[PDB]
Every structure is written in structure tokens, then in C-alpha cells.
Paper text:
One intriguing example is the [name] fever virus, which stands as the sole mammalian-infecting virus encoding a type II topoisomerase. The ORF P1192R encodes a functional Topo II (pP1192R) which is highly conserved across diverse ASFV isolates. Prior extensive structural and biochemical studies have elucidated key aspects of Topo II catalytic mechanisms. These structures have unveiled the inherent architecture of Topo II, which is characterized by two principal heart-shaped functional domains: the ATPase domain, responsible for ATP hydrolysis to fuel the molecular machinery, and the central domain, which interacts with the DNA duplex and contains a catalytic tyrosine residue that cleaves the DNA duplex. As a result, Topo II not only relaxes DNA supercoiling but also disentangles knots and catenates potentially detrimental to cellular function if left unresolved.
The apo pP1192R (full-length and the central domain) were plunged-frozen on an amorphous alloy film (R1.2/1.3, Au, 300 mesh) at the concentration of 0.8 mg/ml. As indicated by our structural analyses, without DNA binding, the apo pP1192R undergoes dynamic conformational changes. Notably, three distinct apo conformations exist: pP1192RClose, pP1192RCoil-open and pP1192RWHD-open. A comparative analysis of the three apo central domain structures (pP1192RClose, pP1192RCoil-open and pP1192RWHD-open) reveals that notable conformational shifts are evident within these structures. Compared with pP1192RCoil-open and pP1192RClose, pP1192RWHD-open exhibits an apparent separation of ~26 Å between the WHD subdomains. Compared with pP1192RCD-DNA, two catalytic Y800 of pP1192RWHD-open also rotate by ~40° and the distance stretches to 32.6 Å. The diverse positions of Y800 across these conformations serve as indicators of the distinct functional states adopted by pP1192R.
Author numbering:
A (entry chain A), B (entry chain B): 701 to 1192
């Protein structure tokens, strides 16, 4: 449980509670995207999705999911937050109060990242006989290794250093489109379990850099030296270390305080800007003391602006169970076929529903045509009308499932929708036998048949079904992340 | 306006505000008889009925209308009250707090005293473009001189000493029923403006008595003498004087305090019980001082337990205006013909509505029969269906007024209900042509025609219409008042 909550799935990078937060949010702001306050939304959550814990951790994790700061664990804010949600400069955890700040669901992104139609398709866990969360979402991108995580967690320290964006764009556009030259070469690679394409950590809003040594990567920040004023200007840090913790860590080592004179903090979470005046003969005696090597100079040994980016990637598979990984390539391998199978189930279900709609509307317009021959206004039993409408060719229909085909398997969709009462022909007094309604129902049958033929085309798409849909959806997610990040999560 | 508010109508004995109170109460407790508190009900009043004053006088008059004490101005509680609404012993005005006591509408009486069906029939005053109160109610009894009123009011001191109950029962059962031997003799009397029947003031829960001198009655209370203890026990008062005001009025006259020793108050509003010990040789020296006459003895001069019942009866006629009276007989004369005219309008309106219902349901079952000949499923316009259903004999019906005939004159009821669309035949798909519905609609036509024949009988009732209805309704009011008085407005 504790391991099951604090180590995420390889499909979400999120807890069960985080998925509950998102599910309740989609349930909330669907009709109207007006910003709530935090506690109203939290009460909505704890009522609806059965948030099984206390509201302190609820409001905590909600504002954690609203942490929009450079170097957060979210490159993608789930919620547009209005207020004051934190600062990396002051350790990150300096948000506002749960009475002032406003959360709002960023549905203009979430409709694209999460397939809104396929929300029905997901294997839910209907506990307590009631509507509960996805067992796992499925995103358009593989989101579960696109964002950082650095926490004391169960079993292992949870550590997900990020990747790039366009590397995964290239990988997935490669795996889908056959217009890749490397397309079957990628299938060759996946078949042979070999790595062929660059898979680089993130670079967004981080002006330091990386190298590889051994297997590890080392990250470096920047500095400016001026022995005129005898001041070093620090402008760049390693990956996700707060400002105050760094300055206090500099004031830890009395061995290095032997030349540390004056530390002035001009920084913010917006801009890192630290001015450090040192003693006379600082740098030369540092060179005399600190062994300057290739991996760090005297300044990189002194100020300690490098980081070894060790990782821990041992996630939780669906249908119960923990799957333990070694590379990011394993994660992308595991991520692909579930999305493929989801598109397959998607278009098969849509094909079944289009079958049943065309069947029902044909039977209806057939009755409108046979208004003359039937004319059965000398009957007094409804089951009499059932039997006589079973004479002249009208099929038993359970139109309740026909109008809304909720949550079912495709087999039960075709079985138990055809076993109902004929009330759709029937209800009330006269005038709907008039032919203008007949005409518009025929127009509906024509559009449904054209859509059915488009479905039956896309059933046979190479090399797996629905691939052009997924190219369109990655195009939409590209539009979404461009609109978001290039406006930096303002959406205005 | 102040005269218009503080002098009532001769049909209500109530203010415009009191009629607003009753109207909002019927509007409130209609669906459910679950009691409010006072302030919720007052807010319901001030919102709905446009209560044109402040809530202090509102809660004041509401608890005034919940005053159930022997010697109130209400023999008939409009509202069942739960709490503690006052005491005659302490001057009457010692109610509870407006946020802890409960009012409840006594609809089981009010349905009988106020004709619930004829609530539609009343000439309303629809000001501000919206729903407002009756100009005047009409009760089954002449309520407006059945209950006391003793107040400093505009123009005159408002004074309505009560009558009996069964005197007015005899008067009105005489005016209606021709099985009275005095029936045409009463018509002789009303034609000749003479008084023929006893018209006595109230006696309920007043063990004193009355006599006539000149024109007035004088009312006498009781006393018990014991010169053993030299104590007089007062058990009965005059009509509606509080206990503490009486004892203080006894302690006013120092001329009589020359023998007043000790006044002990064992009384309540339930029971009057006052023990007065006097000085030795009180009564004999009182006889030596007070001139014992016929109209009062030495005790009735001393304790002053008599009352001259002067009156002021100058009420406010409807359609504007003040009508000024001389006798109760004038009031009963004015009261009769309006209720007569109300029954006439009542049964004429019901006759019009039964006409229109039988017309519509005959046209409907005619269409159900002519389903075969029409079969007009080869049309595409609704006005086409209008014209072709105007061919085969189906009348234009404004069914909106037909289903609910609100608030209209009978002429507009027959004019503008026949000028509408044929949508009652029409609006949806088919199955209501199945003839069990036809059968039950025929059953409806049969009961409507039988009820129409009963109406056309009662149109010709001697000597004025609806008189047997009014005998039934006075029987119901008799049942209600006996049921209440045996239960003391507890109704349990």
C-alpha cells in the first residue's frame, strides 16, 4: 500500500491519490471552468472520489500538483493556479494559504494529453459498488518519465531525472509513422532490444550543462570570477537544489570558510544571482590546496556546482505488481503497446456502436414508411403491439444501451442491446410520423454510414490500427505544449 | 390609508396585512403542514406577499393572530401555535420570543371556513404586475362580526363585541333552507327591514351575565362573601379586562382603599381567583356610604364588576369606501348577497370548464377513431396538418387554458380557449392510438357528462343557486368548529 502509493505506475508517474485528484477535477470543471478556491475543490474531491485520508495531505498534494516553479517536479501543471504557490529560492514549500489561492483545471491541455473520449474505455476499479478512479490513465505522450521526482519514498529514494521533449517526440513519431526512414530500423532495434536514438535529459530553463562519465552524467552550473573586486558571481546551480539550502551548505564547511568572506543573496526563483566576496590570496591558495582535476576545477571543487545524477526507476505494473527497470528504453518499450491496444479497443467499440445506431434508425424509418399498412389502432394490449410489430420485421432493441453505451465490453454491447422493449417506436400522441423527421433521420443514417466506412478504413491501417489518429493526437499535444510552455502556463 | 388599515372591511374583520398573512400562509403550508418558526414564516410573507412594512409589526400581528387566550380578539385561531403566546392575567402581551415559538396553518379548519376552490374566484388586486392578495375574502360564516375587537384605532375606538354562534347559525340556515317555517317569513322580514330573531352576545368561557337597559347590555361578574374571614372571592370579571390592570385599578381608588386591607392574587388566564380581605365593619359602612341601587349593589359598586358594552361599527366597503352601520342586522344583510353571487359565479365558471373539457376530449377520441381514414403520414408541414385536420372536423383549441382555467372571466374562458394550435393531437411518436386509452378517455367523458348534468340541475336551485352547497358547507364549518372547540385548537 505504502509502496503502492509512494512508488507510481510506469504509466502515470503519479499516485492513486493524484489520479483521484485529476479524476475529481475533470468531474468538477467539465460544465464550467470557473476557478474555485482550494478547500471547495478539496471537499468536492473527498466527497466524490472517496479521498481515503485527511484533508491536510489532500490540500498538500493539490498545491504540490499546482507547483509551477522552474525546477519543480511538474513541467506540466495539471492545474492553472492563481495566487502564490511557492519559490525554489526559498526551498519551494512557501505556498499560500488554503483560503486565498485558486485552482482551476487546465482542460485545454488535458483534453489533448488525456483522451477525453477514451475516458470511458479505461479499466476502472469500481469498488464499493460505485464509480471510482482509473486503475491507470493512458496519456498521449509517455508522461510517466517526462517529469522529475526527488523524494524520500518507500523502498528507494524516488528519483526521476527528466528527459528531453523532442527526443521522445522523435522516438514516438518514429514508432508510429512509416515515413520515417528509421521506421523498420526502429522495429529492427526494438526486436533486437538495442538503443539507436538520442535520449537526453532536459534542458528547459537550465543554463548549465551535462557530460557522460562511465555510465553517470555530471551536471555543471556556472560562475563568474573577478579578482578586481575579488567577487565570484554564481548564476547557475545544479539540478533542483534550493537557494537558501545552497548558501547554508556553503556556510557549513569551515574548511572552505577559511577564505569565505561575504555572501550576498540577490537571487530569486526567477533568477539565481549570488555575489561572493572572498579574502585576498583566495584562488591561488585554493589551487595550492584543492587538487584541480579534469572532472572539476578549483572553482567547481570549491563552490560545488556539479551533480552526479544517479537514478532509481522501479515502478508499479498494473493488475498488481512491481516492475523494476534499468533504462529509459525499457520504459518506452513497455509504454507503447498499451496505447496501441487502447486504440484497437477504441475503434472496435465505436464500430459496434455505429452498428447498433444504424440498425435502430433503419428500423424506425421502416416503421414510418409502414404507418399505412400497420394502422393498428384497433389494439388494446401493448404486448399485442409487440407481437404484431414482431411480424412485420422490427427487431427487439434495448435502446437504453443504444443511446448511451456506457463502460461495457463490446460483446455485451452487441448482446444485451438487442433484447429490449419496442418503446422507441411508441411513446405518446401522433405527429412524429410526418416525413420531415423521416428526412432528417435519413440524413442521420447517411452520415452514420459514411462514418462507419471511415471506421472500416481505419481498422486496416498499417502497421497497427488507428496510427493516423495517434499522429493527429501527438500533433495536438505538440500544439498544446507549444501553447502552454511558449506562454509559460498562462494560457492567455 | 391608516383608516383603511386600522378599520377593517365588513367581510373580514381583518387588515389588508392580515389577509396578506393568511394568503402567504396558505401559499406556504399547502404542500406540507410542517411548522416553521415565526421569522421564517415572516420572511416568506415579506418576500412573497410584498409586505409593505417592517418585520416588527409583521411578527407583532402574526403573534396577535396566534393569540389563543380566553378573552382574545380571536375565537378562531388562524394558526395553531406551539410555544407560549400570552396571558390575559398579565395583560395579554406576554408572548414568547420570535425565534423560538412556532406557527402553523390550521388548514383543516381553513379549507372549510375559506372556500379553497373559490380562492381562484376572488377579485384579486394584481399590483406591481404580479400576484397579490384578495381585495376581500369571503368566508362561509359572516366572520367579520363573530370576534371581538377592542383597540385604539383610526376615526373611532375599534369595538366589536361578539355575538353568539348558534344565533348566526339559525339566521343563515333560515336564510338558505326553505324547510324553515320562518323562511319566507325571514324574506318578509328582510324585505321589511325588521328584526325577528334573537341576536345574543357570546357566552363561551364567560360565567358572568348580561342584561339590557336602554339600548345597552350591562355585564356582571361574580363574587363570594364571607364576613367570617371578611374575604370576598372574585371569580368572574367583565368582558376582557386583564387581571393585573383590575387589581391596580382597585388600588387606584383611595376612597375605596379606606376598607381595602389585603388583595391576594391566585388567578391566572386559565382561572380568575382573587381573594380580598377587608377591614372589620367594611360592608355595613359601605352600605352606609355606597347607595345600593338596582343597577349595582354595594359590592358591584365597590369592586366594579360591571360593564357598559358600547360599540363602534363603521367598516370599509370593497371597491373603495367606508360603510357605516347601526345594527348587526345591517351587517348580516350586507353579508348575504355577496356570498350568493359568489356561488353563482362559481358554478357558472365550472359549467364553462366542463363544456371545454368535454369538447376537447370528444375531439381527441374522434381523432383516435379516424386514425385509419387520415393516416396522413405523407405530409411534411405542420400547417398542412392544421388545414387537413380542419377538414375532417377538429376544432381549434387553446388547450393551455383548457387544462388550467386560471383567474378568468367566463366570457374570456369561452373566447380565447378556442383559438389555439392542435398540438394536443400531435407532439411525439405514435403508440397512444392503442384503444385502451380510448376506453379510459370515454370513461372520462361519461363522468364529465354526469357531473355536467348535476351542475345544470344545481343551476336551477330554489330560490337562488348553489344553496344546497352552502348548506353542506355550513355543515362542514359546524363540524370544524365543534371539532376545534372540543379540542381547544389542539386538533389532537
Amino acid at each position: 500500500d505504502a509502496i503502492e502509493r509512494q512508488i507510481p505506475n510506469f504509466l502515470d508517474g503519479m499516485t492513486r491519490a493524484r489520479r483521484k485528484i485529476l479524476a475529481g477535477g475533470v468531474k468538477c470543471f467539465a460544465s464550467n471552468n470557473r476557478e474555485r478556491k482550494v478547500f471547495q475543490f478539496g471537499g468536492y474531491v473527498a466527497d466524490h472520489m472517496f479521498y481515503h485520508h485527511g484533508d491536510m495531505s489532500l490540500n498538500t498534494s493539490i498545491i504540490k500538483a499546482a507547483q509551477y516553479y522552474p525546477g519543480s517536479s511538474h513541467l506540466y501543471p495539471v492545474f492553472i493556479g492563481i495566487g502564490s504557490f511557492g519559490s525554489r529560492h526559498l526551498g519551494g514549500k512557501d505556498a499560500g494559504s488554503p483560503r486565498y489561492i485558486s485552482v482551476q483545471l487546465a482542460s485545454e491541455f488535458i483534453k489533448t494529453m488525456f483522451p477525453a473520449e477514451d475516458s470511458w474505455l479505461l479499466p476502472y476499479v469500481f469498488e464499493d459498488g460505485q464509480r471510482a478512479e482509473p486503475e491507470y490513465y493512458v496519456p498521449v505522450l509517455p508522461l510517466a518519465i517526462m517529469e522529475y521526482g526527488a523524494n524520500p519514498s518507500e523502498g528507494w529514494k524516488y528519483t526521476t531525472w527528466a528527459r528531453q521533449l523532442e527526443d521522445i517526440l522523435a522516438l514516438v513519431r518514429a514508432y508510429v509513422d512509416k515515413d520515417n526512414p528509421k521506421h523498420e530500423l526502429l522495429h529492427y532495434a526494438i526486436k533486437h532490444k538495442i538503443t539507436i536514438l538520442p535520449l537526453r535529459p532536459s534542458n528547459y530553463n537550465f543554463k548549465g550543462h551535462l557530460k557522460r562519465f562511465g555510465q553517470y552524467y555530471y551536471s555543471y552550473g556556472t560562475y563568474v570570477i573577478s579578482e578586481q573586486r575579488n567577487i565570484i558571481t554564481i548564476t547557475e546551480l545544479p539540478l533542483r537544489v534550493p537557494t537558501v539550502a545552497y548558501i547554508e551548505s556553503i556556510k557549513k564547511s569551515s574548511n572552505r570558510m577559511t577564505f569565505i568572506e561575504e555572501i550576498i543573496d540577490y537571487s530569486s526563483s526567477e533568477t539565481i544571482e549570488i555575489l561572493v566576496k572572498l579574502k585576498p590570496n583566495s584562488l591561488n591558495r585554493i589551487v595550492e590546496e584543492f587538487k584541480e582535476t579534469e572532472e572539476q576545477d578549483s572553482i567547481e571543487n570549491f563552490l560545488r556546482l556539479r551533480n552526479c545524477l544517479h537514478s532509481h526507476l522501479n515502478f508499479v505494473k498494473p493488475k498488481g505488481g512491481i516492475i523494476e527497470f534499468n533504462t529509459y528504453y525499457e520504459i518506452l518499450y513497455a509504454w507503447l503497446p498499451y496505447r496501441r491496444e487502447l486504440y484497437q479497443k477504441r475503434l472496435m467499440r465505436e464500430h459496434a456502436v455505429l452498428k447498433l445506431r444504424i440498425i435502430m434508425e433503419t428500423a424506425i424509418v421502416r416503421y414510418i414508411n409502414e404507418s399505412a399498412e400497420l394502422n393498428l389502432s384497433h389494439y388494446e394490449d401493448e404486448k399485442e403491439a409487440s407481437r404484431i410489430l414482431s411480424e412485420h420485421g422490427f427487431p427487439p432493441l434495448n435502446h437504453t444501451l443504444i443511446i448511451s453505451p456506457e463502460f461495457a465490453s463490446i460483446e455485451e454491447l452487441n448482446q444485451k442491446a438487442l433484447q429490449g422493449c419496442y418503446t422507441y417506436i411508441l411513446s405518446l400522441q401522433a405527429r412524429e410520423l410526418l416525413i420531415a423527421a423521416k428526412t432528417r433521420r435519413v440524413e442521420k443514417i447517411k452520415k452514420m454510414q459514411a462514418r462507419l466506412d471511415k471506421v472500416e478504413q481505419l481498422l486496416q491501417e498499417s502497421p497497427f490500427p488507428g496510427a493516423s489518429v495517434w499522429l493527429e493526437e501527438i500533433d495536438a499535444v505538440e500544439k498544446a505544449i507549444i501553447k502552454g510552455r511558449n506562454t509559460q502556463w498562462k494560457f492567455h
